[PDB]
Design a protein around this ligand. Sequence first.
Ligand SMILES: *[C@@H]1O[C@H](CO)[C@@H](O)[C@H](O)[C@H]1NC(C)=O
Length: 234
Amino acid sequence: VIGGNECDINEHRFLVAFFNTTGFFCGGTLINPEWVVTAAHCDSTNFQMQLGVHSKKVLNEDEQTRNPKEKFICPNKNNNEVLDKDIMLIKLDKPISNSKHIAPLSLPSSPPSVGSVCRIMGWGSITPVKETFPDVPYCANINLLDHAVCQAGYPELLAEYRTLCAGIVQGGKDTCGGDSGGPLICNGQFQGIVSYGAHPCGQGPKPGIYTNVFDYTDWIQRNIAGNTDATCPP
Ligand SMILES: *[C@@H]1O[C@H](CO)[C@@H](O)[C@H](O)[C@H]1NC(C)=O
């Protein structure tokens, strides 16, 4: 995250860190005791999830480690197009119990509203060009922009992708390398998933692109209910 400050120790109890032998590579969102939502392009053959994490050097005493039991990707997804249905659902190997630094964040109950103030967070690079990864997650406030803005800034962005456009017109605040999979919180609701952006980070004409979570709530709930067959919105 660029242009932000260290997040508060108690404001991200639902933020999950994805890592493997090389370290942190993505974020995620705990939506209930056994399920985590992240970006599809964060999928790997071997990774683990750390919950209740703030500092990577001074450990919270209630940190928890979990492994992916089951992974769910849209059945109707083009595995070549990163912007196509960039969402993945993960069922934890064991349930999680609420603690000081751990608690789920429910799925959105209403669609996002343009102009709304949103908050981004992650352990991604805090520098726009060179990569500088922090030991603590950084947070920043941005705005939900008109979809036309991102459309004009990215030729690859097809209108069929169900995405959200967020940033600030003057630039300076944005997600960056390593924030992928993390949540976009608007009006206190889990409205998006960090999916795509440009480099360097923070350019006014190239805001961040986030997966529209609301559009997939049905598919998610059906997978959680046990269908695991349901298809995603086209
Ligand atoms: C760790 O997972 C990330 C996510 O795909 C990947 O980019 C990275 O190369 C992986 N490292 C190893 C050791 O597999």
